[PDB]
Amino acid sequence: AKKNQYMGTSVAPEIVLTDKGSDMSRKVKTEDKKVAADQAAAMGILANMSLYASLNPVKRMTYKAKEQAPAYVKKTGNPVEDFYPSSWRNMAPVISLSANRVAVAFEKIDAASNGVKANSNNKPFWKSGATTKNYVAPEAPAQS
Amino acid sequence: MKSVITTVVSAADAAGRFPSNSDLESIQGNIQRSAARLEAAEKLAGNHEAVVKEAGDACFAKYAYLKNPGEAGENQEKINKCYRDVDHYMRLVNYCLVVGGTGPLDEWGIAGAREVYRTLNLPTSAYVASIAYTRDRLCVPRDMSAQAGVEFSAYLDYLINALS
Amino acid sequence: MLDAFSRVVVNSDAKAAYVGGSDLQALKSFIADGNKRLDAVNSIVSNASCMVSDAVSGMICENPGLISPGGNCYTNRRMAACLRDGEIILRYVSYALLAGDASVLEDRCLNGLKETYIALGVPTNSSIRAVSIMKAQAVAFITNTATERKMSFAAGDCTSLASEVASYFDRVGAAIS
Amino acid sequence: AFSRVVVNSDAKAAYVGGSDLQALKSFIADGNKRLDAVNSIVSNASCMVSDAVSGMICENPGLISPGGNCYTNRRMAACLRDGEIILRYVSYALLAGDASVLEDRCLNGLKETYIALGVPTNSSIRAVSIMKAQAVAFITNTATERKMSFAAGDCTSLASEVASYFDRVGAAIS
Amino acid sequence: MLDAFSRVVVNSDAKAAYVGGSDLQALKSFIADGNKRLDAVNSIVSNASCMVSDAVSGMICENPGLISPGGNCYTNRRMAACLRDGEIILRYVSYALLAGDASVLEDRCLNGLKETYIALGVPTNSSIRAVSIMKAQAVAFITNTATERKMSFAAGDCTSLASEVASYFDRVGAAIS
Amino acid sequence: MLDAFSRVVVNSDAKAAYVGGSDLQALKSFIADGNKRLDAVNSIVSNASCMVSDAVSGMICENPGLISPGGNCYTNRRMAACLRDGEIILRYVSYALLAGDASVLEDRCLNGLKETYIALGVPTNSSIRAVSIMKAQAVAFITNTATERKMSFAAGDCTSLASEVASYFDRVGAAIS
Amino acid sequence: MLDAFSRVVVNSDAKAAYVGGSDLQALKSFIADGNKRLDAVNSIVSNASCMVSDAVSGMICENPGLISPGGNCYTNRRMAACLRDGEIILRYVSYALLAGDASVLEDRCLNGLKETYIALGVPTNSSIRAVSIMKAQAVAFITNTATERKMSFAAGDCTSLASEVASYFDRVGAAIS
Ligand SMILES: C=CC1=C(C)[C@@H](Cc2[nH]c(/C=C3N=C(/C=C4\NC(=O)[C@H](C)[C@H]4CC)C(C)=C\3CCC(=O)O)c(CCC(=O)O)c2C)NC1=O
Ligand SMILES: C=CC1=C(C)[C@@H](Cc2[nH]c(/C=C3N=C(/C=C4\NC(=O)[C@H](C)[C@H]4CC)C(C)=C\3CCC(=O)O)c(CCC(=O)O)c2C)NC1=O
Ligand SMILES: C=CC1=C(C)[C@@H](Cc2[nH]c(/C=C3N=C(/C=C4\NC(=O)[C@H](C)[C@H]4CC)C(C)=C\3CCC(=O)O)c(CCC(=O)O)c2C)NC1=O
Ligand SMILES: C=CC1=C(C)[C@@H](Cc2[nH]c(/C=C3N=C(/C=C4\NC(=O)[C@H](C)[C@H]4CC)C(C)=C\3CCC(=O)O)c(CCC(=O)O)c2C)NC1=O
Ligand SMILES: C=CC1=C(C)[C@@H](Cc2[nH]c(/C=C3N=C(/C=C4\NC(=O)[C@H](C)[C@H]4CC)C(C)=C\3CCC(=O)O)c(CCC(=O)O)c2C)NC1=O
Ligand SMILES: C=CC1=C(C)[C@@H](Cc2[nH]c(/C=C3N=C(/C=C4\NC(=O)[C@H](C)[C@H]4CC)C(C)=C\3CCC(=O)O)c(CCC(=O)O)c2C)NC1=O
Ligand SMILES: C=CC1=C(C)[C@@H](Cc2[nH]c(/C=C3N=C(/C=C4\NC(=O)[C@H](C)[C@H]4CC)C(C)=C\3CCC(=O)O)c(CCC(=O)O)c2C)NC1=O
Ligand SMILES: C=CC1=C(C)[C@@H](Cc2[nH]c(/C=C3N=C(/C=C4\NC(=O)[C@H](C)[C@H]4CC)C(C)=C\3CCC(=O)O)c(CCC(=O)O)c2C)NC1=O
Ligand SMILES: C=CC1=C(C)[C@@H](Cc2[nH]c(/C=C3N=C(/C=C4\NC(=O)[C@H](C)[C@H]4CC)C(C)=C\3CCC(=O)O)c(CCC(=O)O)c2C)NC1=O
Ligand SMILES: C=CC1=C(C)[C@@H](Cc2[nH]c(/C=C3N=C(/C=C4\NC(=O)[C@H](C)[C@H]4CC)C(C)=C\3CCC(=O)O)c(CCC(=O)O)c2C)NC1=O
Ligand SMILES: C=CC1=C(C)[C@@H](Cc2[nH]c(/C=C3N=C(/C=C4\NC(=O)[C@H](C)[C@H]4CC)C(C)=C\3CCC(=O)O)c(CCC(=O)O)c2C)NC1=O
Ligand SMILES: C=CC1=C(C)[C@@H](Cc2[nH]c(/C=C3N=C(/C=C4\NC(=O)[C@H](C)[C@H]4CC)C(C)=C\3CCC(=O)O)c(CCC(=O)O)c2C)NC1=O
Ligand SMILES: C=CC1=C(C)[C@@H](Cc2[nH]c(/C=C3N=C(/C=C4\NC(=O)[C@H](C)[C@H]4CC)C(C)=C\3CCC(=O)O)c(CCC(=O)O)c2C)NC1=O
Numbered sequence A: 001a002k003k004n005q006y007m008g009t010s011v012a013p014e015i016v017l018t019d020k021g022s023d024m025s026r027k028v029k030t031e032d033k034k035v036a037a038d039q040a041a042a043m044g045i046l047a048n049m050s051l052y053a054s055l056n057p058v059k060r061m062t063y064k065a066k067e068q069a070p071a072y073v074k075k076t077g078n079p080v081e082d083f084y085p086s087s088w089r090n091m092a093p094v095i096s097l098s099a100n101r102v103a104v105a106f107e108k109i110d111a112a113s114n115g116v117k118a119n120s121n122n123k124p125f126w127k128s129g130a131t132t133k134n135y136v137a138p139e140a141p142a143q144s
Numbered sequence B: 001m002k003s004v005i006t007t008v009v010s011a012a013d014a015a016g017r018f019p020s021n022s023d024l025e026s027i028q029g030n031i032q033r034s035a036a037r038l039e040a041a042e043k044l045a046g047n048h049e050a051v052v053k054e055a056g057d058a059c060f061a062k063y064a065y066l067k068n069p070g071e072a073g074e075n076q077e078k079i080n081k082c083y084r085d086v087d088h089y090m091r092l093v094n095y096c097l098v099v100g101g102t103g104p105l106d107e108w109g110i111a112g113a114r115e116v117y118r119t120l121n122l123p124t125s126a127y128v129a130s131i132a133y134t135r136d137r138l139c140v141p142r143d144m145s146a147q148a149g150v151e152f153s154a155y156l157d158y159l160i161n162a163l164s
Numbered sequence C, E, F, G: 001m002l003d004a005f006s007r008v009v010v011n012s013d014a015k016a017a018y019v020g021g022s023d024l025q026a027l028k029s030f031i032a033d034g035n036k037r038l039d040a041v042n043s044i045v046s047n048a049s050c051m052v053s054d055a056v057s058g059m060i061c062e063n064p065g066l067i068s069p070g071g072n073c074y075t076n077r078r079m080a081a082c083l084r085d086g087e088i089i090l091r092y093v094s095y096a097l098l099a100g101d102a103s104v105l106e107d108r109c110l111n112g113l114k115e116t117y118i119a120l121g122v123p124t125n126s127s128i129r130a131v132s133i134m135k136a137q138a139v140a141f142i143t144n145t146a147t148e149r150k151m152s153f154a155a156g157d158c159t160s161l162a163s164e165v166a167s168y169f170d171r172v173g174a175a176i177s
Numbered sequence D: 001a002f003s004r005v006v007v008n009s010d011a012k013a014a015y016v017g018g019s020d021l022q023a024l025k026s027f028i029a030d031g032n033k034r035l036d037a038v039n040s041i042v043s044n045a046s047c048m049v050s051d052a053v054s055g056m057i058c059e060n061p062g063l064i065s066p067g068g069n070c071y072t073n074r075r076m077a078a079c080l081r082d083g084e085i086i087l088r089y090v091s092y093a094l095l096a097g098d099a100s101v102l103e104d105r106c107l108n109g110l111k112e113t114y115i116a117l118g119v120p121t122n123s124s125i126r127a128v129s130i131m132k133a134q135a136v137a138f139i140t141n142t143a144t145e146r147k148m149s150f151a152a153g154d155c156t157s158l159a160s161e162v163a164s165y166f167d168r169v170g171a172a173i174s
């Protein structure tokens, strides 16, 4: 009885004005809609402010972030999987300036030179596999 | 192909006449969209192997019967041909953004796909499960442009409507 | 007819209601300056998608601690829920400008909001600041002093409506402080 | 202890708009010089690392030999990738004014991986000191083959800023 | 109280050792940039009475319940004491900027500051805003990123001193929280 | 054949008059809302196949005597024709929405459709119910109020484009009645 | 047949006019950068056999179904003639570069090539992939742009020749496509 029944239901009066200039065209419609948390357009706000505050020289000091722990990834022993995992393999920021736009982007970038591409080790599994019967070389003794 | 240049030059050729004033307003509308469409082709050209890896196994997570003996994903090498089958359709969406029109889809990917997928017993409902995942795992601004996410999603519904 | 628009908001269900041309013409002469007040609503609700999208991002623009590790606008959903309430606050203020009454603003939107934000640990000192950016937009849109966007209005002075929509935004500020 | 683009788990582009740049350009001292600092680099990003790797070949020609580490054309192509990825993180670090994103996402663990993969670490001193000495000459417009139109003034403190950033790469692979 | 040279002495008195040349390069570099430390102190003390007037009245803007009846900054006697406190935190930070050491800020201004403000009933979430509004205004004039009042400095990097003041203003914020 | 600009020319050529400025009022308004029309056709064409397979399945679930032996959707040849008899209605409506005039469906689709249908024995009262379902789906995509699929537009109003396409579907029903 | 110096004559014989300042200065710009031209054909002939040894190996590595039986590089005599087919078309490009005009390869090399490749069962698209690598191998050598091998010249620009052979390798490719 003390708490109103209407708080967490996220409804709100949406007002729409229609006007075509004439007198018989000027309705106002104050109907009720449950508004929804728009998931996709928050990434146009959360990411752009995360790179607004990345490039502030004097809001990276007097607004210092906390010490975030990394995730529950297990160290294997080879450093090319431990220090440079497959989720961050070959990722680098590319900055694309224009008129009144900074436009960084983090995407997987590579090579060219001679034909091949650097990666071709970790190709997708549909791209390679089962082409030929694959043999293996015997031990070539020593020599002197 | 079907694009804005091939359409107005064909109806010029199918009426025996020079390029008129209405044949140049149309290519004016290619200038007002190329700067909002070629960055959808830019994003897909550098991120394809991550968007085809997760859209390919979204169909195998949906239709798990395909990994049975006698089915379309029997062995491992027929699974790898399906990832090759799906990485063609993302490549042709990239070509439709570059040309501007839907020519590269309905002349290399759509034309004859009914006769092929009926003969070799490939379910088209698993193709449209792998293409509807990409269209939805599509947060708008985050992954692409305003439309650049409007342009890219307008061709992912051309595949789903053509395979149904 | 004006009392029936309270009944579609009381019932907690989507029910629509409206006015005619002649019923508005009797309403715009019952209330004085009624054409100015409907311009005051239309100056806000045509730009209500930009007013919350600037004020929420303007709150991070002076306080980047909300998007910290441990912040209150983090984990991709709290930022979506922050835009939802500033949309709601702009709806209930512009309906209070449309009705000319803050009595629907208090019990339907501001009753118990102070306890709800501290139950979640919502920082109320930043949510003052996101309302005061929206208060500064609402006096700029009504008086047509906005720089990037000027809507063509019929000429005159609208200083009492801008102070009225200032005073409705203070009640949002007074309830959650 | 890296920076605010901790957007490595969802979304990455994060552009900065027009009037939000005026919230940034009235916040950064010599912000017009710093936006012309990174534009002199990433406009010429392909010519730099094509000249940085081939400058290392021109003084150390044993990399093309069999047994060397720039034979087998993918392995040549990995060096033009990793020549550019070092340049791509420096150009973000000059734009942000700090090297904490460069130290934690790029330079971290680089010494252990170059001795594990058989990368000669002393030649990659030489290939990144070329990219130090190149980008000093771009930012002061003393690049001989190509000059860029700029407003009048000096850019000495940004030229001393990027020489510290390329020396952090030489410290991290030593 | 201690300064930047005396902290090097009292750390090496504790080890019974003479201050060698391996501990002088942090101090020989201190007198090298010592002119631009003094150049940046008087950008704070010459703009000081506008900074306290802005930081208090911006705390009223974010938290409007301070000037309600029963608010902490309600009447004229309580309003002037809030203006007097923000001048004192600005005075003791501008000693520690001049000395290069946070000794004298800690044990004359911050000594028992938290237990005073609890006993008076001063709100701690609003009093950390007034030391953080003027934190951003103190890294303004060092970095010369001020909107009005451009000040004629000499060219070079001052972000070491801008980050040192932001250490000192959060030393207040870690003391009254 | 005749779009919104060709319609005002043939009505001026009836009077042998020049197209001046008072008759260019609806055509300067046709262009100013031009992006909303292209945003309206794109919402129909992008999910047209679901729009047809739901409309004739919804016609069958209401009238289950259409698929009985002797019904008009009995065989596979008859049901396949119904799946395009109502897919070609949706096609010529989206030509009419694109061109802003109804002279393409009334000259290539609606002319002589009523005696074509009673020559074949097609029940017209069920053909109208299939078209009536597609009209409800069309206004739920122009306005962004579809239940199972939301699309990405800008902010604003399209109640004039929603009622224009609902008037294009009503002349289909008025032609076969 | 005819070079560029005799191409300007046979275009002028239809004019029946003497050669003067209307058409001579392009030939003057030929000679004035003539030292650049034969400086560029040196760094094709010097490493031509490594180019096609990489071009046909690069052709088979992309499409490995050319060595399988049914592919047109299965037999050793199918693969020995693949080099000499892929060596003459490079040799004819080197004549067009030296003489400046592409009149030599269009008739002694390309007249009747499309009709023979579909008579012998030679795959067309496999050769067009092989000649495109030789297009890329050339422009990495005219301008010292190739990764593994470079040579020392006089400092200057040679993009007119690097765009010329790119116009010389697709007229080979358009003769087969
Ligand atoms: C009609 C009723 C109604 C309202 C009056 C508003 C108020 C409101 N907001 C939230 C819920 C929320 N409100 C915020 C808002 C904010 N956090 C910040 O850091 C910003 C300062 C601020 C706005 C920008 C956030 C982030 C959540 C999500 C909380 C969470 O996920 O833990 C809840 C959910 C609590 C629950 O369901 O138990 C409610 C009722 N929303 C409504 O539905
Ligand atoms: C399957 C196996 C396989 C290969 C063999 C290579 C083959 C190859 N090399 C190049 C590309 C090239 N190939 C050469 C040729 C050579 N480089 C030299 O300096 C020598 C003179 C000569 C080898 C003896 C040159 C100079 C280039 C251009 C520069 C470069 O890309 O490295 C290209 C062009 C890329 C394209 O198609 O557009 C290809 C396919 N790639 C492969 O995937
Ligand atoms: C340029 C355009 C282009 C395409 C669109 C595809 C279309 C296509 N796919 C296949 C061939 C195939 N396509 C698939 C694909 C699938 N099977 C499944 O389990 C799923 C339903 C689906 C992927 C998730 C499979 C498994 C084969 C091999 C089937 C077989 O030949 O036995 C074939 C026969 C020739 C071949 O085997 O490659 C063709 C023409 N190929 C092309 O060249
Ligand atoms: C929902 C539909 C709906 C509306 C939007 C309003 C729209 C509206 N307001 C006015 C008319 C007016 N509108 C204003 C308003 C303003 N003038 C200013 O300089 C300020 C910027 C702004 C106040 C915020 C004034 C001052 C008049 C004239 C006085 C009056 O007629 O009330 C007119 C008459 C214009 C004319 O003279 O022909 C109309 C159509 N009425 C409606 O039924
Ligand atoms: C070429 C076209 C193209 C696409 C369509 C997308 C599709 C897509 N999205 C994500 C990645 C993601 N997708 C989302 C999805 C969403 N976020 C939300 O808040 C909503 C609930 C939902 C949008 C409807 C999220 C949160 C991530 C981050 C990682 C994850 O959770 O999967 C990934 C993995 C790689 C990455 O993280 O970027 C891919 C391939 N990407 C592309 O390159
Ligand atoms: C860089 C840091 C950064 C900020 C400081 C804020 C920017 C910001 N803008 C406004 C102020 C405003 N914001 C708007 C809103 C809009 N204007 C339009 O033309 C659109 C229709 C609509 C969405 C963009 C209006 C109309 C004003 C008042 C006039 C103005 O200052 O532009 C205010 C409140 C009053 C003020 O301080 O000026 C703030 C805090 N956002 C940031 O990112
Ligand atoms: C085979 C032997 C061989 C080499 C030893 C190098 C020669 C070389 N040139 C530069 C130096 C440089 N390289 C560039 C790069 C460029 N200049 C431009 O105008 C373009 C935009 C871009 C790609 C060409 C610049 C700007 C400098 C500095 C100024 C200069 O010396 O030209 C450097 C680095 C400076 C230093 O010496 O420390 C080296 C080692 N290149 C070779 O091929
Ligand atoms: C949106 C993208 C964007 C950019 C790319 C830069 C581009 C840029 N730089 C300057 C303006 C300037 N740019 C430089 C920089 C330099 N001049 C030199 O002689 C050095 C070689 C070089 C250092 C790298 C200097 C010294 C000024 C003038 C002072 C200043 O404004 O900082 C101006 C202002 C010109 C004017 O006043 O009209 C602009 C637009 N700024 C931007 O907003
Ligand atoms: C509720 C009402 C309300 C206010 C009163 C102001 C109060 C106010 N001013 C500033 C912000 C500021 N305060 C000053 C200080 C001054 N400016 C000068 O030109 C003088 C030298 C000196 C005193 C007049 C400066 C220069 C800034 C701009 C940011 C900065 O450069 O520090 C900030 C934010 C600082 C930050 O978070 O980054 C706030 C909250 N804002 C409000 O919302
Ligand atoms: C050596 C360091 C030193 C200080 C920092 C101040 C601290 C301080 N402030 C007050 C006293 C006070 N301090 C405040 C201050 C505030 N209330 C608010 O709402 C704001 C958050 C804040 C201003 C920014 C007020 C309102 C009083 C008066 C309380 C009262 O009269 O009831 C007192 C009580 C005795 C006295 O008045 O002197 C003291 C010791 N004095 C010092 O000697
Ligand atoms: C009696 C009191 C007293 C002062 C007020 C100062 C006045 C002062 N400042 C500097 C000198 C300086 N001041 C600065 C500072 C800056 N330059 C900028 O562009 C930044 C905005 C700002 C950083 C905070 C720098 C970088 C120098 C040069 C370093 C030096 O000479 O020590 C100098 C040395 C030469 C000169 O420039 O005149 C002097 C005498 N010294 C004093 O003894
Ligand atoms: C007997 C079986 C049976 C059905 C199949 C449904 C069929 C059905 N769906 C809708 C009504 C609708 N149908 C759709 C269509 C779609 N929504 C989407 O997200 C897809 C893109 C697309 C194919 C599923 C839309 C958008 C509406 C209107 C909004 C809604 O109700 O969802 C209507 C309108 C009611 C009317 O006016 O007559 C009917 C009959 N009902 C039934 O009784
Ligand atoms: C441009 C506009 C245009 C059209 C609308 C169609 C009109 C049309 N429909 C049919 C023919 C038909 N149309 C239907 C459709 C239906 N019958 C029903 O009971 C359902 C209510 C409804 C499905 C929605 C059926 C069942 C046939 C006849 C199929 C047959 O007789 O074999 C035929 C003759 C048979 C044929 O040629 O295939 C024609 C001309 N054609 C056009 O050119």
Ligand SMILES: C=CC1=C(C)[C@@H](Cc2[nH]c(/C=C3N=C(/C=C4\NC(=O)[C@H](C)[C@H]4CC)C(C)=C\3CCC(=O)O)c(CCC(=O)O)c2C)NC1=O
Pocket (backbone or CB within 6 Å): G056, G072, G073, G077, G078, G079, G081, G082, G083, G085, G086, G088, G089, G108, G109, G113, G120, G122, G123, G126, G127, G130
């Ligand atoms: C005057 C200019 C001139 C030419 C253009 C060539 C054209 C040419 N090619 C071949 C003949 C051939 N050329 C090829 C070459 C190839 N087939 C392929 O699949 C690859 C695309 C390519 C290797 C890269 C092959 C395989 C034969 C068949 C030789 C044979 O019949 O055994 C023959 C004679 C038939 C024969 O050799 O038996 C001739 C005249 N020769 C010339 O004198």
